[PDB]
Amino acid sequence: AELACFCYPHLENDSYKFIPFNNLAIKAMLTAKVDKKDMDKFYDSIIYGIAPPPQFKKRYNTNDNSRGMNFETIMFTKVAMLICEALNSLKVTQANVSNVLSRVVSIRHLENLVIRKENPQDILFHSKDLLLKSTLIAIGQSKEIETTITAEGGEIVFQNAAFTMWKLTYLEHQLMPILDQNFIEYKVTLNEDKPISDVHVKELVAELRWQYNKFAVITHGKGAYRIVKYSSVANHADRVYATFKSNVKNDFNLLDQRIIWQNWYAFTSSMKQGNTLDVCKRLLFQKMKPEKNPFKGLSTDRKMDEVS
Amino acid sequence: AELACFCYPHLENDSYKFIPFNNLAIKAMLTAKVDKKDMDKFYDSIIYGIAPPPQFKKRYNTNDNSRGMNFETIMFTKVAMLICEALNSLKVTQANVSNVLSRVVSIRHLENLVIRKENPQDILFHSKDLLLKSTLIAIGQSKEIETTITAEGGEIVFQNAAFTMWKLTYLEHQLMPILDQNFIEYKVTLNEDKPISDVHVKELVAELRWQYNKFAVITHGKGAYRIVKYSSVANHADRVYATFKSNVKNDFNLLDQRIIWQNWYAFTSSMKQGNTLDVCKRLLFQKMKPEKNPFKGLSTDRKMDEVS
Amino acid sequence: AELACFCYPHLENDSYKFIPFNNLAIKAMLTAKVDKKDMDKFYDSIIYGIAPPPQFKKRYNTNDNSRGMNFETIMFTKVAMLICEALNSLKVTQANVSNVLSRVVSIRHLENLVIRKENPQDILFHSKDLLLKSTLIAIGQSKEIETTITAEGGEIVFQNAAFTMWKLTYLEHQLMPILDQNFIEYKVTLNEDKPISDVHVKELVAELRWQYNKFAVITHGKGAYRIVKYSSVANHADRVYATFKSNVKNDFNLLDQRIIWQNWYAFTSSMKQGNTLDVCKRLLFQKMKPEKNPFKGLSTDRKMDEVS
Amino acid sequence: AELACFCYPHLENDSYKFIPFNNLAIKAMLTAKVDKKDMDKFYDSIIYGIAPPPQFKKRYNTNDNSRGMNFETIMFTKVAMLICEALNSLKVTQANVSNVLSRVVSIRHLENLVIRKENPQDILFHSKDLLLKSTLIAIGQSKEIETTITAEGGEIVFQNAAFTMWKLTYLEHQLMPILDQNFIEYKVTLNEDKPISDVHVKELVAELRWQYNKFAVITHGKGAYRIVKYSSVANHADRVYATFKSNVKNDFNLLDQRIIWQNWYAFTSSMKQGNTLDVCKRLLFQKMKPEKNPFKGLSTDRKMDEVS
Amino acid sequence: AELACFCYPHLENDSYKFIPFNNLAIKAMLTAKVDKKDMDKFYDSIIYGIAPPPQFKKRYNTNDNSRGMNFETIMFTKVAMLICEALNSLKVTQANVSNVLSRVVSIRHLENLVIRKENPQDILFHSKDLLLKSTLIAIGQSKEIETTITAEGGEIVFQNAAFTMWKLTYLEHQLMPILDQNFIEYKVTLNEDKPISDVHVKELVAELRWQYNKFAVITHGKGAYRIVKYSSVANHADRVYATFKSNVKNDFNLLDQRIIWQNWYAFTSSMKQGNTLDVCKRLLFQKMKPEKNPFKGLSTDRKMDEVS
Amino acid sequence: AELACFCYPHLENDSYKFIPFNNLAIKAMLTAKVDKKDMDKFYDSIIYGIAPPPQFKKRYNTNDNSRGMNFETIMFTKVAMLICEALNSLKVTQANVSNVLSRVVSIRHLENLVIRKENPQDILFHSKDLLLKSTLIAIGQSKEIETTITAEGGEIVFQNAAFTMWKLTYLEHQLMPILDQNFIEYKVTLNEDKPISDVHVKELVAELRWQYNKFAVITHGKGAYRIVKYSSVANHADRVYATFKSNVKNDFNLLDQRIIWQNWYAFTSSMKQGNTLDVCKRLLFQKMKPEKNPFKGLSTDRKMDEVS
């Protein structure tokens, strides 16, 4: 979803400030009869302020759409405000503006940031600075990499001196939850962006083999691991390749080769080498030669530990 | 209902300020034994302040009355306050007073204004000025015509550059809802009181033929369209004629002849010509000569649009 | 119940201020082992402040008592505060004190005053002065007579220019409700303590014959009528006589003889003449000679009114 | 309502048997497009059997009708069966048939009979003979007069050696209840159709003056008293006169003149004398000369009884 | 869905009888590890009897499937039994068997038949013969055409002497409901398979223009009309063409050309002429020349009727 | 628990029949004051029949016991009846009797048999013969080995041509559920007691490595596998050794060595060799030499399968 789904620009003294949409104004627009030459221009509901350009109808859930978002929830307002707070601290200019709002962000990441932001126990509740760093990263306005402290959050199910594993709560989301009730995904953030001892990497892999054996360790390349079901690596491969495709504007971190699933490492490093999808994806389905296990006996140890 | 059902006059420094009735004082009065020469004079409950003149018993619902209003709800208080706020900004004088309160207003319009007023997304929530303009129009203390911005509100089901279509929510009202659960009515307000292109009028009629084919486009003549069931045009004809009758004090807008239902246009322009009810009403039931459709193929287009 | 059931004395600069009991302190006392020589002295719960003298155990409901009051409700606190507010405005002295608290008041009247006091529509909500006058009358610290304005309240079921009829809501009380779910009683207060026209008295009797034919019009002699069931006049006769008995400290208003039930008028004027209970009460059960009806046709009129 | 609303005729061996309608077949018909020449002929739903002639649409509640009955309840089936059981025991002939079904009966009386019939404590539960006598009377197929034993039932609130007073439960009915929630009506049936002592008549009047003073004793002339509010005698007068009007087929019992309300006795005996409505009804509103009370002191006695 | 999803064959004296599956046996199979050469052979759960061949996994809803049916409901059992009752009356032979079960039937039609079958008001409840005719038609074992009497049922919203219009209740189904909560579809069955007067056809079209203007009249060609939204004619066109494609085994009734939507009539008669999908479908989107309306003024009449 | 907890003996014609206890009689006994010499003799409640010997107090849950069973549930009755039905078909003799009832059985197995028995889909519902075989095995009165068909049941989560895996539902039990809400256990029964191909054993192990990696494959030695958490192998080791100890009356099946967890196989074969607990158990905690994996690549295959 484009950032233009949550707010509109407004000049206030040479600089642009961003304002949240009223769900009722959006509703009005979904009702409106606009001309084809105004589909890109913001809409005026008259009664509830401005609304997103009519061309974004698809982003909002109606009776004929469940593919969009639930703009009538408080989460929408909350997410809009989270975005506006970030874009306003940037003092954007009359030129960089359109490009900013057209940026496509992940709503689940944004809603997850709100869940963090509103919890008094979360450090983000007390650091209005860390909160911005966390948001800017989310809306692609920060060179910085997402690490634990600035992570989208979720439920911590493992913590190391190097990593923090989160269980993504996308199902219990209000704005745009995962509909597939059979969904489960985890994210591993690096506590610090620095060197990691082999012992600490061994601790993580140990956990991921014992607790998440039916899951594949992959990454979207922005500095964090994604623990997804093997029965869903395919769709990830597509989505990540598609995004690499739009390389007309494009780094990609392959992350530790001792952690990442062998096939995924191949499929991605292959893609980084600038190959075709069919060439890459092909590497994903082929049973490769058993690589030399870096940490042997991991499972056997954890097993005996249990027994005692 | 008379405005005297919601408040009473009070001199405070040469000018009259209006005060809301306590539902308990009204209840007291409905219990009171008043003399026939005091039926027009306000009532003193002693315990809960003043109450409306006993002659208004009929306006309030009791166990023997459902024809009145539900004065014991918070909406009554809210509507009273809405009225008092308007009448107080007028600084009414010791002579124009009685005439003011005896004015009969539409409660549904007033309750609808409250629903707008209390919604933070509605422009009326932020414009205490627009709110007054909207109310004054409702209580007949404004020459101005009701347009979208100052409309009674409801649920927007269509919006143009010229019109905004509202679904009247009279059934879900607290103060005096429509009892006929089979009720459905729409109102089309003009966004601006000015010229309207044929293309924009074509857009509206298109919607009203496709979405509201079982409805007749009519008007009460105050600048806005009313979309009512054909099985209810009759009662509207009576009510509007009756009101025209009280022409001892009386303009009537027939609105666009390309929009208004042919028979209704006839029945009204006939009435404006100062004819009798039987003469007019007669025009309402007769199958007139198929007029020359101004916009042909409207339905055929919308139909194909759907199919694709 | 004694006023000493709701508060205790406290010297603060030569004058006594009254403080409300904590229901938990009362509970502690009902648990306490006190000596027979301290049964009259206030009790110290240590943990929750002072509590009423142990000799008042009977006034509070426990598992072995339903004859008392529900001191654990918020109403108890509310009633205590209502009392304390009144007794504090009197600046009582180190001598009149004990006599004050030993005064027996009617809790239902006190709780009814709270119901009035807390309703924003009631004049008592806005008149902290009228509120005191109303309370002082209730706790026997006012020569003044209870009239509508200072009435204990309840539900108004009739109102005249001379009278206001209230339906006592004793059943829905929290502190000490009537347990007999078959209970119904009304009270008629005089709007003003002054002359009353025969027409206004005729209006009242008309109502009491039509609407309350199964009820007897009586009075406890303090200026107001009590509309009770005939099947309960007996217990009233006893209670009122008993109170007259304690005449060692004693006026008694017989009220309009055209309103009061004949037998009750006899029983009371007989009692005022200082007779015995058996002499008086005897007059209550004997079918007396049909007195000359002052207002004839009252029922016949009201009946025809109905029919039309 | 006509009996043709609950069943249709069917020849089975020279005699006609009556069959209940399926509520779904009735629903089908309310949906049907019938020709004007078939509006009187039964309807074939094809899927759910036969349904009443289309001309009876008005008798059934839909979304545009609350004036009819609730044919979709089990009570409808139950009432239909009650009717069919009665009409079948008559072995009606190919000529008397149409006249039978066109008979208009009182549904409340019929539903009340079902309530009796299904209660194992009611004598009608055990007497399939008494049940028929009770039903036939209800559908006008019995010369016999309705007495207690064959009464429509309800809640007994008084019983004598001569009379039984029932409280009509029309509000709690399923098929076609009274909508006016403010409704209350009583019926007094004669235990036996024979002479009644003055003492027994005195007992009844005593009760009706004490317990039902706000009610008028009237009758529809078929042998039983109806205790209705004075504020509703008017509508009864109309309904009874209207029925007398259809005297083209007509006895009328005025019942005891010492019981019946004076004005009603006048209005009816006047009507029996074959006068006009305006002549009769006029007698209903005029305050007549106080007749010589047959039973004096009735109320005074009951009153003293109470007191003791 | 194949009939083999609800039952399995069984030889009992030279003839095959069909037995319903236990939902628990199906569950067992969805759990089973079968070899690729047994995917077509029935499965033995050991504990709950036989289950459908493993190759049908897709027909049953699990946590990874919502595209199938809800075999764990009672409706599944009920539908299975409905099928088995039909197939058993055929005394199928050791050769025609496999072909029978592989037949693909419409589950909604089958569940709708159960809803009819179990309603005591429905004629199918009483005609075990009509029930079979209705089922056999549904499972393609009857030359006969579906007419009202043997229709799948639903809610009757119009009835003529020629037609019966049903509202498909697919949403409220238990076995395999429509998931698109925005779904609405109607079916018009011919009461009798014979000539239909123009007046009766006029009555139907009148209803379909007034009540279902936003719907397109189409047909799947088996003798009945389907009233679907224009926004869904496309998917119908595909499904019907696809079915025509499997013409290796194929009549197609175009139904009354005065009723069927012009474009659909074209698209189908074109298909019957054996053309390509692109050729046919092309006719569906093109705004054709306004054909000569057979029944003029239909809407204008119905409109005036309403007004009166 | 002893079988004597559910029933008592009774001579009826030279043979003993078993009768179920009334939960109320058991309750009576738990209340009884019995002498120490009667603690082993059945108890007579007088009012509710016989009850188990007082020495069994511990087997029943009271307010001071949660270690026992819930004898007041219907399951207790059901389980008692299941037992009595089995013991009665044996026609036990006046000598073998005491020994029979003193037999300790597993209640969860018995309740699980009831759950099977009462389900109409379960083969045990229809085979009163198979039901007995299944029960007798449970109460140790059958040489036969428990296989799928005669298994205690539960929820099938895997099925082969050789094995059926059940999920034990001990938590949802009524009679004596597992209290540790963190409990999870599985049981693998052999479909047939015969040779099993390596491919079929490979299929099972594949499932147990992929789906139950955190579980250890063990056995109690009676012919079936138990899939328990590694964090609970210890308690199993104790319980199984303890039972082996009572070898004064004793075969032990070690089951397939390619399936059973290496350490458990060692611990048990060691025990079969008649060693000490400390000697055996020692083998359970020591990380043994990586045995030669019989089926390599199992997980790698299943993984790729998923991905596709």
Short mmCIF file of all heavy atoms in Angstrom, two decimals, chain C residues 202-226:
data_model
loop_
_atom_site.label_atom_id
_atom_site.label_comp_id
_atom_site.label_asym_id
_atom_site.label_seq_id
_atom_site.Cartn_x
_atom_site.Cartn_y
_atom_site.Cartn_z
N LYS C 202 -61.27 20.00 45.44
CA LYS C 202 -62.20 19.15 44.70
C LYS C 202 -61.41 18.38 43.64
O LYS C 202 -61.68 17.20 43.38
CB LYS C 202 -63.27 20.02 44.05
CG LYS C 202 -64.39 19.26 43.37
CD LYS C 202 -65.34 20.21 42.63
CE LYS C 202 -65.99 21.22 43.60
NZ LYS C 202 -66.98 22.14 42.97
N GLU C 203 -60.44 19.04 43.02
CA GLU C 203 -59.61 18.42 41.99
C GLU C 203 -58.84 17.25 42.57
O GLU C 203 -58.75 16.18 41.96
CB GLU C 203 -58.65 19.45 41.39
CG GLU C 203 -59.35 20.52 40.56
CD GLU C 203 -58.38 21.51 39.90
OE1 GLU C 203 -57.59 22.16 40.62
OE2 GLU C 203 -58.42 21.64 38.66
N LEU C 204 -58.29 17.44 43.76
CA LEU C 204 -57.52 16.39 44.41
C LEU C 204 -58.40 15.20 44.78
O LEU C 204 -58.11 14.06 44.42
CB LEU C 204 -56.81 16.92 45.65
CG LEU C 204 -56.05 15.84 46.42
CD1 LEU C 204 -55.13 15.09 45.47
CD2 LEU C 204 -55.27 16.49 47.55
N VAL C 205 -59.48 15.46 45.50
CA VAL C 205 -60.36 14.38 45.91
C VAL C 205 -60.87 13.63 44.69
O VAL C 205 -61.01 12.41 44.71
CB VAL C 205 -61.56 14.92 46.71
CG1 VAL C 205 -62.46 13.76 47.13
CG2 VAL C 205 -61.05 15.70 47.93
N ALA C 206 -61.13 14.35 43.62
CA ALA C 206 -61.60 13.70 42.41
C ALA C 206 -60.59 12.62 42.01
O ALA C 206 -60.96 11.46 41.75
CB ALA C 206 -61.75 14.73 41.29
N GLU C 207 -59.32 13.00 41.96
CA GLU C 207 -58.25 12.08 41.59
C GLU C 207 -58.15 10.89 42.55
O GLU C 207 -58.05 9.74 42.11
CB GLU C 207 -56.92 12.85 41.53
CG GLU C 207 -55.69 12.02 41.17
CD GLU C 207 -55.66 11.55 39.72
OE1 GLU C 207 -56.62 11.80 38.96
OE2 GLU C 207 -54.65 10.92 39.35
N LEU C 208 -58.19 11.17 43.85
CA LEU C 208 -58.10 10.13 44.87
C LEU C 208 -59.28 9.17 44.93
O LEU C 208 -59.19 8.12 45.57
CB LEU C 208 -57.92 10.75 46.24
CG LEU C 208 -56.70 11.64 46.38
CD1 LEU C 208 -56.94 12.63 47.50
CD2 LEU C 208 -55.46 10.79 46.62
N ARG C 209 -60.40 9.52 44.31
CA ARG C 209 -61.56 8.63 44.33
C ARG C 209 -61.52 7.77 43.08
O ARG C 209 -61.85 6.59 43.11
CB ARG C 209 -62.86 9.41 44.34
CG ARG C 209 -63.13 10.19 45.60
CD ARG C 209 -64.45 10.94 45.44
NE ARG C 209 -64.76 11.79 46.59
CZ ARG C 209 -65.92 12.42 46.76
NH1 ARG C 209 -66.89 12.29 45.85
NH2 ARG C 209 -66.11 13.18 47.84
N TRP C 210 -61.09 8.39 41.99
CA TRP C 210 -61.01 7.70 40.71
C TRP C 210 -59.78 6.80 40.63
O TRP C 210 -59.89 5.59 40.46
CB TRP C 210 -61.00 8.74 39.57
CG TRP C 210 -60.99 8.12 38.23
CD1 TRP C 210 -59.92 7.99 37.40
CD2 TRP C 210 -62.08 7.42 37.61
NE1 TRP C 210 -60.27 7.23 36.29
CE2 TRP C 210 -61.58 6.87 36.40
CE3 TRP C 210 -63.42 7.19 37.97
CZ2 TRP C 210 -62.39 6.11 35.54
CZ3 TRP C 210 -64.22 6.43 37.11
CH2 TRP C 210 -63.70 5.90 35.91
N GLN C 211 -58.61 7.41 40.77
CA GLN C 211 -57.35 6.67 40.68
C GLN C 211 -56.94 5.84 41.91
O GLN C 211 -56.30 4.79 41.76
CB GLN C 211 -56.23 7.66 40.33
CG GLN C 211 -55.23 7.10 39.35
CD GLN C 211 -55.93 6.49 38.14
OE1 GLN C 211 -56.64 7.18 37.39
NE2 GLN C 211 -55.76 5.18 37.97
N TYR C 212 -57.30 6.29 43.11
CA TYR C 212 -56.93 5.56 44.32
C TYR C 212 -58.13 5.22 45.22
O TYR C 212 -58.12 5.51 46.41
CB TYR C 212 -55.87 6.37 45.09
CG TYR C 212 -54.79 6.93 44.18
CD1 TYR C 212 -55.00 8.11 43.47
CD2 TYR C 212 -53.62 6.21 43.93
CE1 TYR C 212 -54.07 8.56 42.53
CE2 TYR C 212 -52.69 6.66 42.98
CZ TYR C 212 -52.92 7.82 42.29
OH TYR C 212 -52.03 8.25 41.33
N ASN C 213 -59.15 4.58 44.64
CA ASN C 213 -60.35 4.21 45.39
C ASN C 213 -60.07 3.15 46.46
O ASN C 213 -60.71 3.14 47.50
CB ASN C 213 -61.44 3.70 44.45
CG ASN C 213 -61.23 2.26 44.02
OD1 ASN C 213 -60.17 1.89 43.52
ND2 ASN C 213 -62.25 1.44 44.20
N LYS C 214 -59.11 2.27 46.21
CA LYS C 214 -58.77 1.23 47.17
C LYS C 214 -57.80 1.74 48.24
O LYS C 214 -57.29 0.95 49.04
CB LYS C 214 -58.14 0.03 46.45
CG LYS C 214 -59.13 -0.77 45.61
CD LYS C 214 -58.41 -1.77 44.70
CE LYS C 214 -57.94 -1.11 43.39
NZ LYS C 214 -59.09 -0.70 42.48
N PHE C 215 -57.55 3.05 48.25
CA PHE C 215 -56.63 3.65 49.21
C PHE C 215 -57.36 4.60 50.15
O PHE C 215 -58.36 5.22 49.78
CB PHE C 215 -55.50 4.41 48.49
CG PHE C 215 -54.55 3.52 47.72
CD1 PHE C 215 -54.96 2.88 46.57
CD2 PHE C 215 -53.27 3.27 48.20
CE1 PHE C 215 -54.11 1.99 45.91
CE2 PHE C 215 -52.41 2.38 47.55
CZ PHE C 215 -52.84 1.74 46.40
N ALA C 216 -56.85 4.70 51.38
CA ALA C 216 -57.41 5.58 52.40
C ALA C 216 -56.56 6.84 52.56
O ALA C 216 -55.33 6.76 52.65
CB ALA C 216 -57.48 4.86 53.72
N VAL C 217 -57.19 8.00 52.59
CA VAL C 217 -56.42 9.22 52.76
C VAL C 217 -56.19 9.45 54.26
O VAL C 217 -57.14 9.64 55.00
CB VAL C 217 -57.15 10.46 52.20
CG1 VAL C 217 -56.17 11.59 52.06
CG2 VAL C 217 -57.79 10.14 50.87
N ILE C 218 -54.94 9.41 54.71
CA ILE C 218 -54.65 9.64 56.12
C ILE C 218 -53.50 10.62 56.25
O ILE C 218 -53.06 11.23 55.27
CB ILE C 218 -54.27 8.33 56.86
CG1 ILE C 218 -52.89 7.83 56.42
CG2 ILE C 218 -55.31 7.27 56.60
CD1 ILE C 218 -52.30 6.73 57.29
N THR C 219 -52.99 10.77 57.46
CA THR C 219 -51.88 11.68 57.70
C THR C 219 -51.21 11.31 59.00
O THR C 219 -51.83 10.72 59.88
CB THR C 219 -52.37 13.14 57.80
OG1 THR C 219 -51.27 14.00 58.13
CG2 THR C 219 -53.43 13.26 58.88
N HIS C 220 -49.92 11.63 59.12
CA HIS C 220 -49.19 11.37 60.34
C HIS C 220 -49.18 12.64 61.16
O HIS C 220 -48.58 12.71 62.24
CB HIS C 220 -47.79 10.86 60.03
CG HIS C 220 -47.79 9.47 59.48
ND1 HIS C 220 -46.64 8.84 59.03
CD2 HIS C 220 -48.79 8.58 59.31
CE1 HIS C 220 -46.95 7.63 58.61
NE2 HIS C 220 -48.25 7.44 58.77
N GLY C 221 -49.85 13.66 60.62
CA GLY C 221 -50.01 14.94 61.29
C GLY C 221 -48.94 16.00 61.15
O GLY C 221 -49.01 17.03 61.84
N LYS C 222 -47.95 15.79 60.28
CA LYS C 222 -46.90 16.80 60.15
C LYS C 222 -47.09 17.70 58.93
O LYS C 222 -46.12 18.29 58.42
CB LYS C 222 -45.51 16.15 60.10
CG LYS C 222 -45.16 15.30 61.31
CD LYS C 222 -43.66 15.26 61.58
CE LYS C 222 -43.28 14.08 62.47
NZ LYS C 222 -42.93 12.85 61.68
N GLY C 223 -48.32 17.81 58.44
CA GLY C 223 -48.57 18.68 57.30
C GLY C 223 -48.72 18.03 55.93
O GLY C 223 -48.92 18.75 54.95
N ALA C 224 -48.63 16.70 55.84
CA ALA C 224 -48.78 16.04 54.54
C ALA C 224 -49.68 14.80 54.58
O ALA C 224 -49.74 14.09 55.59
CB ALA C 224 -47.41 15.67 53.99
N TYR C 225 -50.39 14.53 53.49
CA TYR C 225 -51.26 13.35 53.43
C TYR C 225 -50.49 12.09 53.03
O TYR C 225 -49.49 12.15 52.31
CB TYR C 225 -52.40 13.56 52.43
CG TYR C 225 -53.22 14.80 52.67
CD1 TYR C 225 -52.85 16.01 52.11
CD2 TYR C 225 -54.37 14.75 53.45
CE1 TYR C 225 -53.60 17.16 52.32
CE2 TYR C 225 -55.13 15.90 53.67
CZ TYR C 225 -54.74 17.10 53.10
OH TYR C 225 -55.48 18.26 53.32
N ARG C 226 -50.96 10.95 53.50
CA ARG C 226 -50.33 9.68 53.17
C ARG C 226 -51.46 8.85 52.57
O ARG C 226 -52.51 8.68 53.21
CB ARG C 226 -49.80 9.01 54.43
CG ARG C 226 -48.52 8.21 54.24
CD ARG C 226 -47.30 9.11 54.30
NE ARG C 226 -46.07 8.38 54.58
CZ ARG C 226 -44.87 8.96 54.70
NH1 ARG C 226 -44.75 10.27 54.57
NH2 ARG C 226 -43.79 8.23 54.94
#
